[model samples]
Target: ATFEIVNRCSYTVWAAASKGDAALDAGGRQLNSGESWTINVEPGTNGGKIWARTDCYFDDSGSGICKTGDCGGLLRCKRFGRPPTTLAEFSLNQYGKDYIDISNIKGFNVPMNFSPTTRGCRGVRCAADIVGQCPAKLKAPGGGCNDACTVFQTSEYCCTTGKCGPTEYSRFFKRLCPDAFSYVLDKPTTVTCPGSSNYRVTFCPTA
Candidate 1:
């Protein structure tokens, strides 16, 4: 995972469009197994905005997470930790060929035990205006994209980067773990136990 940051500095810096309002022009270095790259991010300290993408995490929460069709959202590259260490990991339960239900009672925390799985989530997400009525118009300039679908699910995938949805396709995880847990955006969550099964509690950090 070796790459170069455009030294031109003339290029505009942009933060990934997510549920958060923070933006950064300072790019990030890719991470590799057993390998770490550090950039002189600041005066001398080597640290700054970092990001990652994945095809995992979607499981049936009815949030329309994984399948494929009208999924929309920006890439959310987050690491879960308390002291904030990226070295934490989790072991996925093998109930058949599926991953473990490590999500908390609320199904929010994706246990740090298993390898992070990425998901194709809902479409059309802004750093601020999320969880509301859809916007009148959606645009992705940096990614040079323009789709006239109000649903955001039909919008073109902005491979580059900018304000846009995660995917034009969608799926839900709630359908699978309905009895296990549920997913939520805000914190201080509560997870209800499944009817005939003992609830497994493993609440990890939520980004």
Candidate 2:
């Protein structure tokens, strides 16, 4: 499987990809406007996630932080990034199936769209203006929207201890990007591709 991370936003975006416990990009790559980077996933790769980092400032040594989507203050993400980011998650060549989704379960910072470059696969996207309309209660410090679970952290918002469903908060996000994973059990938001696939993941396409 392969992924071409594209940045269509006006400014620069630092892209991060992680599979299992390791970083796929080795060192995160910065994509300015109209730029993209391609990454290849081995046959058995699983639990793959790719997201964009905004407002980042790293020196020659690659030591700094991003206002959003910072992976523990390191340029190379050996671990998953902090949330309030637009995530494109995937599982490639898993038992003859490939799974993918654009999730706002942790809330959204930027718009993201996932499309299969190869023929025959249906594409999925979440290109709504989430940041401009982020709820007052769920607003993140530097920018973007935070998930209800991150804001309230209650059983109702987190849906960890028991059953829970959409709230007024969750509904707000779902209304704009209906295909995105808005909450814990947001199963309908995902799309699948059989066997290995090639995809184009775009950030802030509206820009």
For every model shown, the clashing-pair count is: 34, 0
lDDT per residue for candidate 1 within 50-165, as digits (tens), equals 22212223324322221111123222222221111111111112232112222221112121221222232111101111112222242222121122222233323322233333
Clashing pairs in 2: none
lDDT, residue 28, candidate 1: 24
Worst window of 10 by summed lDDT in candidate 2:
19-28
Local distance difference test values of all predictions, in order: 0.20, 0.84
Using all chains and alpha carbons, the TM-scores for the candidates as numbered come to 0.18, 0.95
Instruction: Give the TM-score comparing model 1 with the true structure, all chains together.
Output: 0.18
| Positional deviation of residue 60's Cα in model 1 after best superposition, in angstroms | 43
Candidate 2 global CA lDDT score: 0.84
**Candidate 2 vs. true structure, TM-score:** 0.95
